[PDB]
Design a protein around this motif. Sequence first.
Motif, PDB file in Angstrom:
ATOM      1  N   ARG A 109       0.846  -1.176   0.000  1.00 19.99           N
ATOM      2  CA  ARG A 109       0.000   0.000   0.000  1.00 19.99           C
ATOM      3  C   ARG A 109       0.883   1.228   0.000  1.00 19.99           C
ATOM      4  NH1 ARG A 109      -5.339  -0.688   0.544  1.00 19.99           N
ATOM      5  NH2 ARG A 109      -5.796   1.515   0.996  1.00 19.99           N
TER       6      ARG A 109
ATOM      7  N   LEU B 260       0.516   5.413   1.193  1.00 21.35           N
ATOM      8  CA  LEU B 260      -0.290   6.181   2.130  1.00 21.35           C
ATOM      9  C   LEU B 260       0.297   7.572   2.287  1.00 21.35           C
ATOM     10  CD1 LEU B 260      -2.139   6.817   4.590  1.00 21.35           C
ATOM     11  CD2 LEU B 260      -0.491   5.530   6.004  1.00 21.35           C
TER      12      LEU B 260
ATOM     13  N   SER C 259      -5.057   6.673   0.967  1.00 21.33           N
ATOM     14  CA  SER C 259      -4.170   5.534   0.747  1.00 21.33           C
ATOM     15  C   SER C 259      -4.690   4.692  -0.417  1.00 21.33           C
ATOM     16  CB  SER C 259      -4.035   4.671   2.009  1.00 21.33           C
ATOM     17  OG  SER C 259      -5.181   3.847   2.207  1.00 21.33           O
TER      18      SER C 259
END
Length: 257
Positions: free
Chosen positions: A55, A57, A169
Amino acid sequence: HWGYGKHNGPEHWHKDFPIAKGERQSPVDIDTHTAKYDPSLKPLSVSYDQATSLRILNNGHAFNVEFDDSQDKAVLKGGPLDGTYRLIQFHFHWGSLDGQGSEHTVDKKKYAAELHLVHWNTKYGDFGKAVQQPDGLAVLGIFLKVGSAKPGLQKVVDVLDSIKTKGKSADFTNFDPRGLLPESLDYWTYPGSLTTPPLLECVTWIVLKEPISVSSEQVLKFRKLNFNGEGEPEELMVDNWRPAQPLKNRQIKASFK
Ligand SMILES: NS(=O)(=O)c1ccc(C(=O)NCCCOCCCCOCCCNc2cccc3c2C(=O)N([C@@H]2CCC(=O)NC2=O)C3=O)cc1
Ligand SMILES: [Zn+2]
């Protein structure tokens, strides 16, 4: 809370985090002429061939590419390190103009940006326990200068539009951090700290001598990000770097003659 502006920036952090005036804070100026070559240093091993990104963010201070660190997949070892350190995330610090941005400096020279690849000591089980130890963390720092584009960075650049503001995100799998490394692994090393609050003194810093080149277009996309959340007054995310701190009683070692 804490930030990089006039009223909550680095000069204010010591009020909530008195370790900010401690004995091994980061970053520092690297005086290349007082750093000493250390032959006792083992070769540095960066083993990223099986890194698994998850991910990306925007946390209101920078953007973090976070990795799956549940197995030994992307590891730093050798050099000044005992045992194995596992990559957890990377992020950058950068300026409002190309003449500033880095956190470490080299003979007072400021680079346009600095990449931090953050690793925790696997003897301590995970990141949270590692930041309770004086050798819990190792951060690999890489300087960025503006010039030719870095192809391996473009996938990061192109996703920033999706995480413009604090709290946003996005999925970000299959990113290869090897595309962010310079040719040489020559480095300086010294004991220091996290450069953002809580400023905890648990980092072995490994700062590479050779910078990577990124293009103006790439860093300009970094500068389109926002410190604020959506629906607040726009504050561009620039100059999110802490200035150099007192070296105090510390020695910087060089890995090269
Ligand atoms: N740029 S870089 O260097 O590469 C770099 C820089 C940064 C990173 C990075 O990872 N950042 C993330 C940081 C992760 O660390 C977090 C460690 C947190 C430690 O635990 C904090 C516990 C707080 N609790 C306390 C503590 C003491 C006293 C009290 C209490 C607390 O609650 N109360 C009361 C209780 C109940 C309530 O109801 N009210 C209250 O007031 C207290 O009296 C990575 C790389
Ligand atoms: Zn950092």
